[PDB]
């Protein structure tokens, strides 16, 4: 043994479950809300189902320059009306 408390000891203890019957659901709900509030889209820059294309275009907004790539994406995002 290496001195830490056995896992089977911990996870059958009432105190473990008093603590984790709150902390586990609270994290799950935080993750749910990260998506349901739409915040995940904006943090990572991921298109919503209605923002892959403009209404009549069918070309990909593909990045084609190295050092103006940031401006190119920003320009593609404006053109979504």
């Amino acid at each position: 043994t290496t001195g830490e408390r056995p896992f089977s000891d911990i996870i059958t203890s009432v105190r473990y479950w008093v603590i984790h019957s709150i902390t586990i659901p609270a994290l799950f709900i935080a993750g749910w809300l990260f998506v349901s509030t739409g915040l995940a889209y904006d943090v990572f820059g991921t298109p919503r189902p209605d923002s892959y294309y403009a209404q009549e275009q069918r070309s990909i907004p593909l990045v084609t320059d190295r050092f103006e790539a940031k401006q190119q994406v920003e320009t593609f995002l404006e053109q979504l009306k």
């Binding site: 290496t2 001195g3 830490e4 998506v35 995940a40 889209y41 904006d42 943090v43 990572f44 820059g45 991921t46 298109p47 892959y52 990909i60 907004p61 593909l62 990045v63 084609t64 320059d65 190295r66 050092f67 790539a69 940031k70 994406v73 593609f76």
Partner: protein, 342 residues
């Protein structure tokens, strides 16, 4: 001298549930970041602006089709640092430009270095020979040749493998159509090493389990072994006679047996890595010139070699426009190679 260096050394090498060590300062952040980057990207990040692909659970992909995709071909071989001149410190843009890919590849490479340092470090503390670390050079040779050297020989990171299940399958098929990689003898040796390793794994496991000495009374034979017993738990002599009579030859030196089990898969992976170094430069085993001269002149001459090139040509023409969107390939229907009817 018991200065701060030696006290730190004491704490790093404590016998705990997860050994840490000096190697752990490199290993643990880099492995954690590479893994967290892959999970973050496959859950939330798109490939729309680099590849024209959806690639995250957020977009509706499943475990087989999510990926952290390579950057756009226009990024070249850019490090794509978060603070570099492309993303300019903008985390959201960075994700959209493929910064997670170099992030995963580079933290992964240094994580692999850290793991092999860990194998050396623990081996020196326990007093064993470092052959496990020596064996781990083969996975490192694979990772470095496929994820770093190969794209570095090509036009950009875009052509490296992307980190995903179906993205890697695309990588396999691209290598058939463009490189004829099944024809390459360095791949062939790699195949031999991997399949022979799987073979040795199965046969040695089965031979031990079926030449066991009866060292207990239970019908479950696992209980009749003690880690500190001095005796071999199975009969080398009976195993050697069985295989000599079934197969013609057998092992007789158990130290050679286990070295060979190290040797075979390790040598195979190293061979495949060399072939991929060649493919970095398009230095392929694509053709047999003698076959092509005969077949150019004799339209009745057909082999499985010429048949497979036709398949490669189909792969190239039918996948290239979607797979390389920055090239803007417009192939009218009439130029596409097709057999009759299909």
């Amino acid at each position: 001298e018991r200065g701060w260096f030696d006290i730190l050394d004491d704490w790093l090498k404590r016998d705990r549930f997860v050994f840490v060590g000096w190697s752990g300062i490199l290993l643990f952040p880099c492995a954690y970041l590479a893994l967290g980057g892959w999970l973050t990207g496959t859950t939330f990040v798109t490939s729309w602006y680099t590849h024209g692909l959806a690639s995250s659970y957020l977009e509706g992909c499943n475990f087989l089709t999510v990926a952290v995709s390579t950057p756009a071909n226009s990024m070249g071989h850019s490090l794509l640092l978060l603070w570099g001149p492309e993303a300019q410190g903008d985390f959201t843009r960075w994700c959209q430009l493929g910064g997670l890919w170099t992030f995963i590849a580079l933290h992964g490479a240094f994580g692999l270095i850290g793991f092999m340092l860990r194998q050396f470090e623990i081996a020196r503390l326990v007093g064993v020979r470092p052959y496990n670390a020596i064996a781990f050079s083969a996975p490192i040779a694979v990772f470095v040749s496929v994820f770093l050297i190969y794209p570095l020989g090509q036009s950009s990171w875009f052509f490296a493998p992307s980190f995903g299940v179906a993205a890697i399958f695309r990588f396999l098929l691209f290598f058939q159509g463009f490189h004829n990689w099944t024809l390459n003898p360095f791949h062939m040796m790699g195949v031999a090493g991997v399949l022979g390793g799987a073979l040795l794994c199965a046969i040695h496991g089965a031979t031990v389990e079926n030449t066991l000495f009866q060292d207990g009374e239970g019908a479950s034979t696992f209980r009749a072994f003690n880690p500190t017993q001095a005796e071999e738990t199975y009969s080398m002599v009976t195993a050697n006679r069985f295989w000599s009579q079934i197969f013609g030859i057998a092992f007789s030196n158990k130290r050679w047996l286990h070295f060979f089990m190290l040797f075979v898969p390790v040598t195979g992976l190293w061979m495949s890595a060399i072939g991929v170094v060649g493919l970095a430069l398009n230095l392929r085993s694509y053709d047999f010139i003698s076959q092509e001269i005969r077949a150019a002149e004799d339209p009745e001459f057909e082999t499985f070699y010429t048949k497979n090139l036709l398949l490669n040509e189909g792969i190239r023409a039918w996948m290239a426009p979607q797979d390389q969107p920055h090239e803007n390939f417009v192939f009218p229907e009439e130029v596409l190679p097709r057999g009759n009817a299909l």
